[PDB]
Write a protein that binds this ligand. Structure first.
Ligand code: SF4
Ligand code: SF4
Ligand code: CL
Ligand code: CL
Lengths: 254, 254
């Protein structure tokens, strides 16, 4: 209870430690990395699973390079054959392979600890990504110091850290096994097309379900795609990408 | 070439024969039955597979009773366990079981032939329903006499036969095995709800795909369901019926 008390609790923890930070680019994973660079010999490690586009990785690298946070990105052949046909435990298996790599880096570098940007608010949601993680003894310092979503934003503003657009995992679009590089690309192009041609600035999802495109969208964005000329253009272009059927989820986001 | 030449060709064929007609209620299957009643000892047989609602069977019975066509309806336990998990050859298996029954009735009644309302235009479309049928030696007299769609309508008007609404098979809505009585009911209620509350008079389909409702509709009917209040009401009521997800096929009918 008190941001300076948390800010100074955090600095005391980082003092004289060799810290490897699970750096992704996101507000939370960025803030933990910046504070660590200023107070400890710190390396921001980004594991490229094949779930985030080149642009998202470039953005993460360009943020660390901008805020003088030492960062190394590791491309991994994670999408294999056993790993590709997972679907239900993939958020655990993906985060288990990441933790496996960070643990290797720490041991090769003879570093002391591995930290992640898990905030306090993140513990009140079903997150199998931090189930697999906290199995491998990864310390979540923000959660331990009760950092809320607005605490992370406020401290970020003070530390001159820009708030980036929320680039989310693209394996989430895959609703039917397997999670293929092409299956994700099909969703990515469909999203990019609808967002650019029809200007869906807010929430947009093109889910893959056995080659069926399920379009999810916000309530106030709805009007932008209701003319039959837009519906025909979307149905036509999405089938050209590779889809069998183009459907729209009538459950619009609140 | 010439309707009276076809009308009189047909009467010559029916003379002195005991005819069992595959009667369904539809314009084509009705016209063949009426002409047969007037010129031969004829029985219009309707096989209730469990694919057409009580109302559709009642309509078929009330048409035959109105046009003094002798008709007997046979309820069959067709939806079983081996027959229920078919999907791709179900239009062949359904029409194979029907032909199996009509052949039994003909042999028990010691009747001469079995005819069906397959018109000439019906031979230029992939119909596995008349593949299974013409295997069991069922004569399609309308097709043999080159009767087109408009020839059937014109002769029907002359014979004072009313043209009914096109009640279609409800196993067609089932896109994922098995074709269950409940699975079809889920589609039927969804169609009845949208057609009554939102007035979709023309083409409307609520397909079942592993508990996912796929709404198919006409191009000019589209406008009737574009307000977010209608979309919310449809998504809500359809999930109450039993669906997991309510989606709309963006391929509107021409
Ligand atoms: S959300 Fe995506 S990146 Fe995160 S654990 Fe799940 S699969 Fe991996
Ligand atoms: S359309 Fe329906 S009633 Fe006709 S053969 Fe196919 S399953 Fe049977
Ligand atoms: Cl994530
Ligand atoms: Cl049929």
């Amino acid at each position: 209870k008190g941001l300076l008390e948390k800010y100074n609790s955090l600095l005391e923890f980082f003092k004289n430690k060799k810290v490897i930070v699970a750096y992704s680019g996101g507000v939370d994973s960025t803030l933990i990395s910046k504070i660590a660079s200023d107070n400890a010999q710190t390396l921001a490690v980004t594991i490229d699973n094949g779930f985030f586009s080149e642009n998202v990785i470039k953005k993460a690298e360009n943020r660390a390079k901008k805020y003088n946070i030492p960062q190394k990105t590791i491309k991994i052949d994670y999408l294999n054959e056993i790993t590709s046909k997972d679907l239900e435990n993939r958020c655990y298996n993906c985060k288990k392979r990441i933790a496996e790599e960070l643990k290797r880096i720490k041991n090769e570098l003879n570093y002391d600890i591995i930290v992640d940007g898990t905030i306090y608010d993140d513990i009140f949601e079903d997150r199998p990504g931090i189930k697999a993680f906290n199995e491998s003894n990864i310390i979540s310092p923000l959660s331990n110091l009760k950092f809320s979503k607005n605490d992370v934003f406020e401290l970020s503003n003070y530390l001159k850290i820009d708030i980036p657009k929320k680039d989310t995992c693209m394996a989430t679009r895959i609703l039917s096994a397997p999670i293929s590089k092409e299956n994700m690309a099909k969703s990515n192009l469909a999203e990019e097309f609808i967002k650019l041609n029809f200007h869906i600035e807010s929430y947009l999802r093109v889910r893959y379900l056995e080659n069926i495109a399920i379009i999810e969208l916000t309530k106030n964005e709805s009007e932008k795609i209701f003319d039959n000329d837009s519906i025909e253009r979307i149905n036509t272009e999405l089938k050209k990408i590779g889809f069998e059927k183009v459907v729209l989820d009538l459950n619009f986001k609140g």
